[PDB]
Amino acid sequence: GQWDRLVLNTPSFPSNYWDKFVKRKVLDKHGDIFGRERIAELLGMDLAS
Amino acid sequence: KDMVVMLLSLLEGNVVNGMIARQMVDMLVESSSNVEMILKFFDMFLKLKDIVGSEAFQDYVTDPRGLISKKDFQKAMDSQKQFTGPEIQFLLSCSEADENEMINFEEFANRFQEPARDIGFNVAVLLTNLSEHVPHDPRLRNFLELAESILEYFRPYLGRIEIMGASRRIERIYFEISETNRAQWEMPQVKESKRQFIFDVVNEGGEAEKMELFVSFCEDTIFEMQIAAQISEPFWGELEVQRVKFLNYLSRNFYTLRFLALFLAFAINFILLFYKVSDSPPNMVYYFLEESTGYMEPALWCLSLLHTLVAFLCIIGYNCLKVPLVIFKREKELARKLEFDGLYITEQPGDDDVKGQWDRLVLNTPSFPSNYWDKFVKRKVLDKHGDIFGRERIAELLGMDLASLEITAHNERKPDPPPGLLTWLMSIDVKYQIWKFGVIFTDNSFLYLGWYMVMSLLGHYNNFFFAAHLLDIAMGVKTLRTILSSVTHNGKQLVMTVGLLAVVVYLYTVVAFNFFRKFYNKSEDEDEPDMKCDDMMTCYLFHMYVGVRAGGGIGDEIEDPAGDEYELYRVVFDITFFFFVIVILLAIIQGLIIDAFGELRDQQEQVKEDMETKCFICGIGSDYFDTTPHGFETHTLEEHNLANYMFFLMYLINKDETEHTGQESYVWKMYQERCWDFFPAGDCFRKQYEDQLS
Amino acid sequence: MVMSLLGHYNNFFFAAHLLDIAMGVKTLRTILSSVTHNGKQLVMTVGLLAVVVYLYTVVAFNFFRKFYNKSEDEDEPDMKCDDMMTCYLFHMYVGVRAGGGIGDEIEDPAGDEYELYRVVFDITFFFFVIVILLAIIQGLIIDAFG
Amino acid sequence: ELRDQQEQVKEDMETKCFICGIGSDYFDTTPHGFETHTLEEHNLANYM
Numbered sequence: 001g002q003w004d005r006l007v008l009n010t011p012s013f014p015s016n017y018w019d020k021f022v023k024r025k026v027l028d029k030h031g032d033i034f035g036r037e038r039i040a041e042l043l044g045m046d047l048a049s
Numbered sequence: 050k051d052m053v054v055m056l057l058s059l060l061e062g063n064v065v066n067g068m069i070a071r072q073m074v075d076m077l078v079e080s081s082s083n084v085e086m087i088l089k090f091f092d093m094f095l096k097l098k099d100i101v102g103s104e105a106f107q108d109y110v111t112d113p114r115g116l117i118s119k120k121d122f123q124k125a126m127d128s129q130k131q132f133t134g135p136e137i138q139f140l141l142s143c144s145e146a147d148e149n150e151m152i153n154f155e156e157f158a159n160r161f162q163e164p165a166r167d168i169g170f171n172v173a174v175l176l177t178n179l180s181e182h183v184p185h186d187p188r189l190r191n192f193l194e195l196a197e198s199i200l201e202y203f204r205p206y207l208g209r210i211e212i213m214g215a216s217r218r219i220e221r222i223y224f225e226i227s228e229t230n231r232a233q234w235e236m237p238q239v240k241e242s243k244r245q246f247i248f249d250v251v252n253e254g255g256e257a258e259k260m261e262l263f264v265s266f267c268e269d270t271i272f273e274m275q276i277a278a279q280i281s282e283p284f285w286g287e288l289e290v291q292r293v294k295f296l297n298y299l300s301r302n303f304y305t306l307r308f309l310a311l312f313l314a315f316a317i318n319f320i321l322l323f324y325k326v327s328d329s330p331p332n333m334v335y336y337f338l339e340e341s342t343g344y345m346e347p348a349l350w351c352l353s354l355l356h357t358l359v360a361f362l363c364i365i366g367y368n369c370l371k372v373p374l375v376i377f378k379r380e381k382e383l384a385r386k387l388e389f390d391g392l393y394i395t396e397q398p399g400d401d402d403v404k405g406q407w408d409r410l411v412l413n414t415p416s417f418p419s420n421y422w423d424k425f426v427k428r429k430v431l432d433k434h435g436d437i438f439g440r441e442r443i444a445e446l447l448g449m450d451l452a453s454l455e456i457t458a459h460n461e462r463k464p465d466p467p468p469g470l471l472t473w474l475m476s477i478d479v480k481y482q483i484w485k486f487g488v489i490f491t492d493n494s495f496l497y498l499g500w501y502m503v504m505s506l507l508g509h510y511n512n513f514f515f516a517a518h519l520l521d522i523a524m525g526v527k528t529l530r531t532i533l534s535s536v537t538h539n540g541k542q543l544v545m546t547v548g549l550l551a552v553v554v555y556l557y558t559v560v561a562f563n564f565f566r567k568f569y570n571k572s573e574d575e576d577e578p579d580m581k582c583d584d585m586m587t588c589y590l591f592h593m594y595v596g597v598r599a600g601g602g603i604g605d606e607i608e609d610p611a612g613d614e615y616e617l618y619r620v621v622f623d624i625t626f627f628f629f630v631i632v633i634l635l636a637i638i639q640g641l642i643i644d645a646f647g648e649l650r651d652q653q654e655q656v657k658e659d660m661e662t663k664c665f666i667c668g669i670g671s672d673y674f675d676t677t678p679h680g681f682e683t684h685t686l687e688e689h690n691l692a693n694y695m696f697f698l699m700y701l702i703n704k705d706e707t708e709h710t711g712q713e714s715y716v717w718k719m720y721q722e723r724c725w726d727f728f729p730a731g732d733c734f735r736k737q738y739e740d741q742l743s
Numbered sequence: 744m745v746m747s748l749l750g751h752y753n754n755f756f757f758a759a760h761l762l763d764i765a766m767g768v769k770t771l772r773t774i775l776s777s778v779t780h781n782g783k784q785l786v787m788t789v790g791l792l793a794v795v796v797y798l799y800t801v802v803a804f805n806f807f808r809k810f811y812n813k814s815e816d817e818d819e820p821d822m823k824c825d826d827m828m829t830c831y832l833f834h835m836y837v838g839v840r841a842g843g844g845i846g847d848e849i850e851d852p853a854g855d856e857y858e859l860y861r862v863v864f865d866i867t868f869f870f871f872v873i874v875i876l877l878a879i880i881q882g883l884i885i886d887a888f889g
Numbered sequence: 890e891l892r893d894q895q896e897q898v899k900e901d902m903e904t905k906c907f908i909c910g911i912g913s914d915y916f917d918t919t920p921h922g923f924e925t926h927t928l929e930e931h932n933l934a935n936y937m
């Protein structure tokens with residue numbers, strides 16, 4: 001669990017796993033309570049893009 | 050809350066799809082709007098409590114003093130998106146904003162929580178009861194959906210059980226569980242005790258006394274919970290408070306002290322490996338350390354002192370932590386025997402029961418119910434058995450003052466003995482203390498720790514006695530306990546096998562002493578002969594010592610019989626010795642150990658299978674429940690969880706009798722009478738309402 | 744791969760790759776799994792064996808030193824239990840490997856004031872160490888099979 | 890073999906009635922049903 005923190009911010013995270021949209025799904029699920037910008041920083045996401 | 054209690058009382062003894070429940074649902078439907086308003090009140094404030102702790106809110110709150118402006122609060126609410134605009138306006142109105150429009154969100158959140166918890170819990174109980182007794186009603190499912198947050202919040206605190214009620218019908222009971230009770234239950238020691246109790250009742254437990262054993266386990270667990278609470282941390286009085294602090298610290302850190310003692314013993318023996326013996330100092334030999342550093346002797350001295358100190362502290366920690374449960378259990382069983390069995394009134398122990406004979410001392414003692422709660426057991430016994438066996442006689446047996454019994458009832462008297470050393474000495478009850486000391490010295494763990502302490506003290510006299518404390522690794526490690534238990538399991542059989550081995554060797558020795566003496570010379574020098582079988586005792590010692598240890602038997606040691614008139618007799622002798630003694634008897638030992646392994650394994654496997662296949666309470670199999678998906682899991686977690694029965698017992702004990710409901714009073718009276726018929730056996734709510742539920 | 748590369752430096756490192764037969768053969772994996780199943784228990788049993796041998800070594804170092812001379816030449820004596828470390832090594836090395844225990848290796852106590860003490864010492868060593876603890880190992884393996 | 894013989898005897902006696910052969914489950918449908926059956930209803934000592 002500590003090691004897996006590195007790959008969260010990586011663009012290539014869902015490289016072998018099919019779901020490429022899991023980051024946006026998590027942002028939708030937990031953005032309101034935990035902050036959209038904060039989730040984006042955690043997951044390497046560019047809110048504008 | 051009172052009105053909801055009245056409604057729940059109306060629902061007492063309510064069958065599935067009952068008229069009263071359906072009319073309650075109709076009333077709720079008629080009052081739907083106001084019910085929704087109430088649920089919205091509760092959910093708004095519950096959600097606010099978590100939102101204000103949410104960090105996102107902390108992002109919006111910039112002000113150092115912890116206050117949040119009305120505008121920033123509104124922005125945070127809309128960001129969370131869980132609230133509507135009207136709800137945010139209502140929250141702002143309820144906020145006690147100062148003239149600067151600044152709000153203290155902490156107090157705003159904490160204000161309505163505590164007042165509304167009881168009503169929230171009772172509303173959840175009402176809705177749960179109604180849902181379970183009217184399973185198919187969209188009008189009720191809508192209310193439940195509105196109350197989802199409340200039910201989620203109160204889920205850990207809602208305990209449900211099933212009993213056989215006065216109506217010959219299974220009834221579900223809903224009650225409240227305290228967070229402290231749940232935490233104390235979840236403590237690891239309680240879990241280990243639960244595992245041990247389950248293993249015992251499943252491997253060597255009778256179904257008839259299963260519920261009595263379960264109730265006793267619950268009582269003991271409550272007592273341990275009290276002990277844990279007491280020891281838990283948040284000029285004679287000053288000395289007393291530091292003393293209790295020190296004792297509580299020892300009790301809390303008892304196991305760490307045990308591990309520390311083990312580590313110290315290991316270090317001491319590591320050092321002891323370095324001794325050497327020489328005639329000269331560094332006719333009578335000298336034992337001296339050998340080290341280049343030279344710092345090792347004082348280290349050993351210190352380690353010995355610390356080990357002894359830790360042993361003494363472990364004694365104290367045991368006496369403070371675990372002895373009280375021993376005394377509580379012993380007092381409880383004696384009280385129950387007196388009240389119900391009438392042991393010392395009618396039956397009288399057999400004189401084969403040393404414990405029953407020992408317990409006579411404490412009957413007449415004032416301090417008898419010192420650790421056990423019931424202080425009135427003596428008067429109860431006097432009422433029960435006085436007429437047949439004599440009130441004065443019972444009073445003499447139990448140390449009771451018939452006159453003072455009446456005065457205690459007439460009014461309270463205060464004979465204030467201001468605290469003093471002499472007053473404490475008077476308070477000491479010699480007979481009770483002696484009985485208690487006998488109990489403790491009989492306790493095995495106390496004996497082991499005392500042996501530990503004595504061996505450390507002797508180690509100070511001779512440092513090599515510190516090696517015995519390395520045997521504590523057994524008790525330290527569960528794996529070692531299991532391995533040793535494998536041997537102990539068939540230990541009596543092993544001793545009998547050894548005795549048989551001795552007997553067979555004795556017979557072989559007789560045969561040798563009579564017919565085969567010449568072959569037992571163990572001397573090469575012909576002038577001086579050393580005959581081991583010229584005497585029977587020497588021959589027996591020789592056989593038992595060399596032959597058993599040998600792989601081929603005695604024939605390996607004794608002289609070749611080739612070219613002798615008794616050659617065939619001796620080869621039979623030796624081969625039979627080899628086969629019977631070396632092969633079989635040893636093989637018997639190894640097979641006993643192997644069988645012990647399998648027996649322990651199958652015990653654990655059987656316990657696990659019984660717990661996974663059947664309910665501990667009702668005994669109904671997993672198949673019936675699994676007819677419904679996850680049915681057995683739901684049954685063992687919700688319907689018939691034993692933890693919930695324990696929590697119910699605690700809840701009844703804490704609750705006032707006048708507040709008791711009909712179900713609670715029924716179960717309480719049956720518990721006091723020690724009747725366990727209310728426990729559902731062979732029946733369940735599902736089975737009873739099978740057709741109505743579906 | 745590393746063992747092969749080291750094998751190029753010294754060809755004898757290629758023997759380690761014969762341990763791959765385990766993973767190659769399912770039967771070998773099952774047999775080895777029988778041991779691994781109770782491996783922790785086996786290690787604990789070995790530790791207990793070491794502890795008991797240590798206790799016996801203490802007893803010998805205190806009371807039975809004279810019996811631990813392993814030299815026939817009287818002029819030069821080789822005493823294995825004049826030091827505790829040497830005595831422990833001697834016990835763990837010879838006694839366990841022996842079938843009758845340490846008594847097989849050390850000198851006959853006949854005609855000595857401590858004869859009965861030593862026969863108890865040797866017989867108890869034999870029964871507790873050689874018979875039981877080993878038997879515990881074999882029973883653990885047997886139980887793993889079942 | 891001897892161990893499993895004893896265990897099987899004990900399990901058979903605890904699960905089924907010596908007389909009727911009906912299992913403990915049917916009787917335990919009623920609380921303490923098997924105990925009542927083996928002590929009162931179908932006690933072999935009473936037949937003797």
Ligand SMILES: Nc1ncnc2c1ncn2[C@@H]1O[C@H](COP(=O)(O)OP(=O)(O)OP(=O)(O)O)[C@@H](O)[C@H]1O
Nearest residue numbers: 240244660661663664665666685686689690691692
């Ligand atoms: N009446 C019952 N109440 C509770 N559990 C029951 C009951 N009847 C059977 N069980 C079985 O007991 C199991 C309880 O879990 P278990 O004994 O594994 O302990 P635990 O509290 O979950 O934790 P741990 O495994 O750490 O000890 C349930 O999953 C179920 O299999």
Ligand SMILES: Nc1ncnc2c1ncn2[C@@H]1O[C@H](COP(=O)(O)OP(=O)(O)OP(=O)(O)O)[C@@H](O)[C@H]1O
Nearest residue numbers: 901902903905906907908926927928931932933934
């Ligand atoms: N028809 C039956 N009659 C009596 N016992 C039966 C019958 N069917 C099964 N049993 C089982 O036999 C048990 C009888 O008890 P058990 O065999 O342990 O001997 P006991 O007379 O109680 O005494 P002890 O254990 O000292 O021999 C009953 O508890 C029940 O488990």
Ligand SMILES: CCCn1c(=O)[nH]c(=O)c2[nH]cnc21
Nearest residue numbers: 267268269271272422702721
């Ligand atoms: C551990 C003792 C707790 N307890 C109990 O187990 N049963 C009771 O009837 C009672 N009355 C007050 N305390 C009680």
Ligand SMILES: [Ca+2]
Nearest residue numbers: 706707708709
């Ligand atoms: Ca009342």
Ligand SMILES: [Zn+2]
Nearest residue numbers: 664666667689
């Ligand atoms: Zn059940």
Ligand SMILES: [Zn+2]
Nearest residue numbers: 906908909931
């Ligand atoms: Zn029958």
